[PDB]
From a paper:
Inositol pyrophosphates (PP-InsPs) are eukaryotic nutrient messengers. The N-terminal kinase domain of diphosphoinositol pentakisphosphate kinase (PPIP5K) generates the messenger 1,5-InsP8, the C-terminal phosphatase domain catalyzes PP-InsP breakdown. The balance between kinase and phosphatase activities regulates 1,5-InsP8 levels. ScVip1PD is a phytase-like inositol 1-pyrophosphate histidine phosphatase with two conserved catalytic motifs.
Crystallization of ScVip1PD Δ848-918 yielded a second crystal form diffracting at 3.4 Å resolution. The two apo structures of ScVip1PD revealed a conserved histidine acid phosphatase core with two insertion domains. In ScVip1PD Δ848-918 crystals, two molecules in the asymmetric unit also adopt the “open” conformation. Crystal packing interactions between two adjacent GAF domains in our ScVip1PD Δ848-918 crystals are mediated in part by a second Zn2+ binding site. The Zn2+ ion is coordinated along a pseudo two-fold axis involving residues His573 and Glu575 from the GAF domain. Given that ScVip1PD behaves as a monomer in solution and that the histidine and glutamate residues are not conserved among other PPIP5Ks, the second Zn2+ coordination site is likely a crystallization artifact. Similarly, deletion of the large disordered loop in the α-helical insertion domain (ScVip1PD Δ848-918) moderately activates the engineered enzyme in vitro.
Author numbering: 538 to 701, 709 to 913, 915 to 962, 973 to 1025
The structure:
């Protein structure tokens, strides 16, 4: 009895955001500022090659910490051609308005990975199969939206190709708005106390019963992190690191691997200083490495041999992955609101325009004689739109805490049949990243959709929603 579909889709796999920062006083580094006495940003690929050349000059004639110029230079050579890669030069002025030192900040990442096109194409083909079995006329009524971010449009483009300018960027609905950033900071400060001292798993807050107090979990993660840093150092100092993995996608090499983890090891070596914003960073890198650098991850963290044969050795690492998922399940989802009122206000400030559009599109599909509208959005809108759904009081089949992580290519579906059925998918998500069978593509298949509600009267679902718009 199908009549239409309004599907919200998250962007596909992306690389972790990474940056190197160092300050230099040598003249060759100061000359990169080209006389300017304020922050200088470099994003022209040709300008990056010139800066790259400056690092090679510094190398031949010692100008700065040689070890640190190599890591910046090596990272830049591999990353100079990636959109979003930039250099920031922050000059430091002394009492006489003279630049005495310049901070060199190299930032890169946040681009869709080589795996994203595969994930998006499978979904577009799957949806073509699904549609050509429900009603072939639906393909003639496809409308596609995308945020302005490159990673989001990238996902939208390959899904559209797989499904069949038609993609209509809509900044007001699907791009980020500073309306909720004022309120998410009020919330962010509220999460720090939840993790420290001895808060007894405050209220429900998405936390397992068998787990000890949040502060104990953090302290154990620090122990596992301090443990693996020493393994990594021991492996770099003794073994050949360049032979620990035969495939390096995205132009990465063992040096960039060490940098991502060296930073995290620095940020997770004192439990009384762990920042809750950095839990998501730790967990984002663990998925990335488990997806794209498993072999090197195995070997560079391989302890060796402890007497007995085949004695399991990746015990401390599996524990670390498990504990990071707990922290990611009870901090990051609560950046969009802790209390129901916070989840509500942040949810409206972020996704109210999109929510009004969806109900109207469902209303049009009822009056037309089926169609589909796909909105490709950043990760933030999926949580917030979901929060609006729950706080509306509409009868659910599953509680919020029970939903799986809203991973890459997570979807929210509004199926119109008169009756509305809500379904969701966690996207390309796995419960055992260290055991999943991977291809050379470093690509995980997508999880089928699950029903959030049953068939609910259309006229009913509009009152509960329009009552929350006050
Ligand atoms: Zn200037
Ligand atoms: Zn890869």
């Amino acid at each position: 009895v199908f009549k239409g579909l309004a599907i919200i889709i998250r962007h596909a796999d992306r690389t972790p955001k990474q940056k190197f920062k160092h300050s230099f006083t040598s003249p060759i580094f100061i000359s990169l500022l080209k006389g300017h006495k304020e922050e200088v940003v470099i994003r022209n690929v040709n300008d990056l090659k010139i800066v790259l050349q400056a690092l090679r000059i510094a190398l031949d004639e010692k100008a700065g910490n040689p070890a640190k110029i190599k890591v910046l230079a090596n990272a830049l050579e591999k990353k100079l051609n990636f959109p979003g890669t930039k250099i920031q030069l922050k000059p430091v002025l002394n009492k006489e308005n003279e630049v005495e030192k310049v901070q060199f900040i190299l930032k890169w990442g946040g681009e869709p990975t080589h795996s994203a096109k595969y994930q998006a194409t499978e979904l577009g083909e799957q949806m073509r199969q699904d549609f050509d079995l429900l009603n072939k006329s639906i393909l003639q009524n496809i409308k596609i939206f995308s945020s302005s971010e490159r990673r989001v449009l990238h996902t939208a483009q390959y899904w559209t190709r797989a499904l069949f300018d038609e993609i209509s960027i809509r900044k007001d609905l699907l791009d980020d708005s500073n309306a909720a950033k004022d309120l998410m900071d009020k919330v962010k400060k509220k999460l720090k106390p939840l993790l420290r001292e001895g808060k007894e798993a405050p209220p429900q807050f998405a936390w397992p019963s068998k787990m000890p107090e949040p502060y104990l979990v953090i302290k154990r993660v620090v122990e596992l992190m301090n443990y693996h840093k020493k393994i990594m150092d021991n492996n770099f100092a003794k073994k050949d690191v360049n032979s620990m993995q035969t495939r390096w996608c995205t132009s990465e090499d063992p040096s960039l691997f060490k940098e991502r983890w060296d930073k995290l090891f620095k940020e997770f070596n004192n439990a009384e200083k762990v920042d809750p914003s950095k839990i998501s960073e730790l967990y984002d890198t663990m998925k990335y490495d488990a997806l794209h650098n498993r072999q090197f991850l195995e070997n560079i963290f391989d302890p060796g041999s402890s007497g007995q044969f085949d004695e399991p050795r990746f015990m401390q690492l599996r524990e670390l992955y498990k504990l990071a998922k707990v922290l990611f399940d009870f901090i990051c989802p609560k950046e969009y609101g802790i209390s129901d009122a916070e989840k509500l206000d942040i949810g409206l400030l972020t996704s109210l325009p999109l929510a009004k559009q969806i109900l109207n599109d469902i209303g049009d599909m009822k009056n037309r004689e089926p169609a589909c509208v796909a909105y490709f959005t950043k990760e933030s809108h999926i949580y917030t739109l979901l929060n609006i759904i729950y706080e509306s009081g509409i009868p659910m089949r599953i509680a919020r805490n029970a939903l799986p992580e809203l991973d890459y290519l997570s979807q929210i579906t509004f199926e119109l049949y008169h009756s509305i059925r809500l379904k969701m998918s966690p996207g390309c998500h796995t419960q055992d990243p260290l055991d999943v069978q991977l291809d050379d593509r470093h690509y995980i298949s997508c999880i089928p959709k699950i029903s959030l509600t049953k068939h609910l009267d259309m006229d009913y679902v509009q009152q509960k929603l329009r009552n929350k718009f006050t």
